[PDB]
Every structure is written in structure tokens, then in C-alpha cells.
Amino acid sequence: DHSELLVNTKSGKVMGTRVPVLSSHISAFLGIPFAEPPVGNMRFRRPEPKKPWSGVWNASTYPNNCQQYVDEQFPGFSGSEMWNPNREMSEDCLYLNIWVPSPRPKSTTVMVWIYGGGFYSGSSTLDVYNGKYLAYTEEVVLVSLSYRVGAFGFLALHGSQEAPGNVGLLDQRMALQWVHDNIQFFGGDPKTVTIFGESAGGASVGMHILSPGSRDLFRRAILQSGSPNCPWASVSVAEGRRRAVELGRNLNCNLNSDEELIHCLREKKPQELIDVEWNVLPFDSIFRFSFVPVIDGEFFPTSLESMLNSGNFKKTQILLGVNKDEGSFFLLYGAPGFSKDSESKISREDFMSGVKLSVPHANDLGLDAVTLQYTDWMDDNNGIKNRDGLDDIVGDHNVICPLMHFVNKYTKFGNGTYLYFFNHRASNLVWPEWMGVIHGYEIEFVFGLPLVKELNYTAEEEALSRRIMHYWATFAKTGNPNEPHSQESKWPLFTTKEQKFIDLNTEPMKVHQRLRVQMCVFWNQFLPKLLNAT
Numbered sequence: 001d002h003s004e005l006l007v008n009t010k011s012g013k014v015m016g017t018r019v020p021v022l023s024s025h026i027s028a029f030l031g032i033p034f035a036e037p038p039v040g041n042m043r044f045r046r047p048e049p050k051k052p053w054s055g056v057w058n059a060s061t062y063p064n065n066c067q068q069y070v071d072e073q074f075p076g077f078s079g080s081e082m083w084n085p086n087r088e089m090s091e092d093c094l095y096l097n098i099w100v101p102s103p104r105p106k107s108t109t110v111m112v113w114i115y116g117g118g119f120y121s122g123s124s125t126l127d128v129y130n131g132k133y134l135a136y137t138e139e140v141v142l143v144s145l146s147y148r149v150g151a152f153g154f155l156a157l158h159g160s161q162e163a164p165g166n167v168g169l170l171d172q173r174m175a176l177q178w179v180h181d182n183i184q185f186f187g188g189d190p191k192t193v194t195i196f197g198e199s200a201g202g203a204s205v206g207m208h209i210l211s212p213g214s215r216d217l218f219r220r221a222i223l224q225s226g227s228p229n230c231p232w233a234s235v236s237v238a239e240g241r242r243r244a245v246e247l248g249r250n251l252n253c254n255l256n257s258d259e260e261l262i263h264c265l266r267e268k269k270p271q272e273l274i275d276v277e278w279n280v281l282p283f284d285s286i287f288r289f290s291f292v293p294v295i296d297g298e299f300f301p302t303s304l305e306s307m308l309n310s311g312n313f314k315k316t317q318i319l320l321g322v323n324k325d326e327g328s329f330f331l332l333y334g335a336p337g338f339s340k341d342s343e344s345k346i347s348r349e350d351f352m353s354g355v356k357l358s359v360p361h362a363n364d365l366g367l368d369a370v371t372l373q374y375t376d377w378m379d380d381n382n383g384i385k386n387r388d389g390l391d392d393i394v395g396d397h398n399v400i401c402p403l404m405h406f407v408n409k410y411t412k413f414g415n416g417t418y419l420y421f422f423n424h425r426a427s428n429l430v431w432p433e434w435m436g437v438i439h440g441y442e443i444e445f446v447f448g449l450p451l452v453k454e455l456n457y458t459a460e461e462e463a464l465s466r467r468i469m470h471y472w473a474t475f476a477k478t479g480n481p482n483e484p485h486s487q488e489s490k491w492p493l494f495t496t497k498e499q500k501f502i503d504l505n506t507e508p509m510k511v512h513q514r515l516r517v518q519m520c521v522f523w524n525q526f527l528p529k530l531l532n533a534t
Ligand SMILES: *[C@@H]1O[C@H](CO)[C@@H](O[C@@H]2O[C@H](CO)[C@@H](O)[C@H](O)[C@H]2NC(C)=O)[C@H](O)[C@H]1NC(C)=O
Pocket: 414, 415, 416, 417
């Protein structure tokens, strides 16, 4: 061995770079391949392990981002472009980034970030995902993987070995397997690996907790604004097939067999599949994505619900939670009456239209049931109440409630649960006030962006970010976000009986119980029974 930026792994030697972080410095190994480029005949196929390389791999720069749809709704607007690919897109995108504190540790806690983006997008190279602040502040080895999104990572034709589906999830598993096998050489503890992600990434984390082929590869898990049982997180094999065939019809493909559909989809250029990607949705809706994980019977032995009921999942500690206004982002992009530059006061007519889009798989009685649940008949023509009520509908149906279901089901067999409710609006948030505490805006606090003075955050927002970063890191290290024998306020353990959680904001810690039970009893217990009877 030689320098601190030189690591000899089971795959080969890797050369990193010294990165500046808050006056100090740490190491960074960017763009390390954990799989063979899924290009050509391997498109849609399961990931193959990266053949070991000879010589030194240059890991000083960020890798390419996977082929995905690019947000062009508000050009120049940072609020929407901060989520867009900041590196060149390519199908050769299966790489991982590692931030190692300096001096290189011997055996410290490891955290693997799994980005979100509805399974149709996302990048590990984003600014809000820069793990250098967390790695440095909390003294952890921050890893951020990457996986194929869109059709490339989730096209599903059950029965076929050329495109079985869930390969995007297998990409994550191979990265986790690479972390299990090589993180030791970077000073990380393979015995203490915490996987954490947001939205689609949080659902992925929960999917790895459920899938037996992924359970042994990590210790603990953190789920942010995401759950494996989210209505948008997965589809049946029949629906996945239907969407795959529909994708082919949109590209003038031969649909007589799977062998011919796939051959066609493989000859087409990346952007060709992306341009027609949305055309396969079965309904006119919001918070719904085309190619997502499928219940194949392999990655997922049986239905997610049956697995959750039987305790068929990894027993360990989990830390999860949701943001206050999760639905705003989606109403702004597809619901009539919403716009980035207006207060977006919603009319009774637009409210009814919003409900239709929010619960696509519902009939008329179901639509009336949802409306009844979120309507104040004493003041039904209130524009602000209609706007906020619709925001609650999208967030509760798509994020909050399904997560609350997973929380209650998991805790019964689990070994420790910690629930949070992030309800703080960043003072420098570029999005309109009507959106509130937006889906994905806790990430900046998790990654410690508020510590960087040049980002215009307040003092209390830095204190909050430091508090959150420490909760996450301490939990990853021990299984409890609370510092042993500390004088600070204690974050209660979530139990099947008490059901406690905390608010994650700038004010002193406050403890509550039964996070949105009123609305979630409706979404998890009543509505599904109503739609089922009719
Ligand atoms: C998490 O799992 C650990 C290990 O199984 C539990 O600790 C045991 O708890 C039982 C009952 O209180 C004790 O009799 C054992 O002595 C404990 N074992 C150890 C090694 O400490 C722990 O209770 C579980 N925590 C939760 C919240 O379920």
C-alpha cells in the first residue's frame, strides 16, 4: 500500500481525491463500477458483476447518470433543476460514490444512500446528495449507489430472462453486495451498514427489508417519505406486461412474442423509450409512474401485504418519517388550477378534478368518499381549504398513510422503530409558500447543506441539520438515534401500543401519538373495503 487516496479492493485498485469540506478535508472515491455496463444485449437484463480490473481506476470525478426523463417545466428554476441529472446521461451508469473521513478510519459506521425519483429518474451525483458534509461531521463512510430507472431498470415481462423486471432493484443489491465485500478497505464496518433513501429510495429500502435476497447485505435502514407498499411503488406482473407491450406499440414494434418485443426495444435509442414512457399509464393520474418494481414472486416471494402480515421480512431497527406537505409537488405538475407563480386557490370544480387524478383506481362512490373525508361543508367554496385539502389527499394516499401502515405492521415483529414528522419550511426555499414543507426538502437537512454558509440558511436551520445528521448517524451506528446518557430531549421509541413520534423542526422537541390516524384509518381500512365491495 501507499497513499491515503489509494485503496486496493477485491475488484481492483481505486484512486480517490482530496475534497474540501467546511475548512477541513476528506477523501472521495467517485464513480466506482459495481457492475458491467448494462448496454447492448444486456439492456433490461439482470446486472452482471463488474469484471475485476488491472491497474488503477481513476475515481476522482463523478460518474454518468442513468438515462431518464429530464424536467424542463421551469427552465433556469433551481427548485426543479436541482433534481435533474447534473452529469452526462448514459446507459453505462452503474457506479457508486464513497466519502471517507480523513484520516482513513479502521472500522466505522457505513451509510448507503439510495436516491428517489419515482423509479423513472434520479441521480447519485446531485448537490443535495453530496455526502461529504455527513461523512465529515458524523465521522461515517457515506456511500451513494445508482440504479437503472425508467424502462431500462424496470421493464417487466414475467417469464422472460431478457427482461424479468426489478433489475433496477438488483442493481442496488449488487452495489450493497459490493459494499459488503469491499467497504472494509475504505475503513467501513461491513457489520454496521445502514441503507437510507428518500421517496422511491425509501420504498427501495423497504423492498430490501422484504426481499430475502437483500436482507443479509445490510444492518439497519432509514426510510424518508417512502414505503414499499406505496400505491405507486409497484405493479402486478400482468400490469407490468401490459405496460411493456404498450411501450412497444408506441414504438412500432413487433408484438407477436416477448423475444421480438425486447429485440425491438433494444435497437431503439435511449431517448426514444423516454419520449413515449408516460403514454403507458393506464389512467389519467398524478403521482403515478410507468416502470416500477413488479410483484414477480422472486424478488418479492408473495404480495407485500401478505409478507407484512406474516412477518416475512428482516427484523432490525428502522427510522422513518414523512414531511408535512408531500402532495404539493404532484398537484403543481398535473392537477388543474395549480401553478408555480399563483397562490393556486382551488375552485370546487378543480377540487373534484383533483380527486379524480389522485385516486385513479377509484369508482364514483370512492370519489365521493374521499371528497366527504376532506371537505368542510360549512365552507365548501374556500379556495385555500380546497387547495390544502387536495394537498393532504395526495400526501396521505401516496406517502403518509401507506408509510403508517408499514410502520404499524413492521413494529409488531421489528426490533426498534423511530418515527418523525418533518414540518419545517426552509427559509430559502424557492418554491411558492402554498407548497409548504415539500416532498424531498428534508434531504438538504439530512445531508447537512445548512452548514454551508454560502447557501443562505438560518442559524436554527444549521442547528436542526446538525441535530438530524446526528440522529441519522447515531441510529446507524447503534440502532438508537439518541446519544446514550445525554442531557438532550429523548426521541421516543415507536411501539404498537403507544405509537409515539416526534416533530422534526427548529422548535424544542415535541412528542405526539398516532400520526394522522383519522385520515389513515380511511385510506388503509375504510376506502380499500369500500372499493372492494363495489
Ligand atoms: C431487540 O432485540 C434484542 C435482542 O433480542 C432485545 O433484547 C433482549 O430483550 C429481552 C426482553 O427484554 C431480554 O430478556 C434480553 O436479555 C435482551 N437481549 C439482549 C442481548 O439485550 C430487545 O428487547 C429488542 N428491542 C425491541 C424494541 O424489541
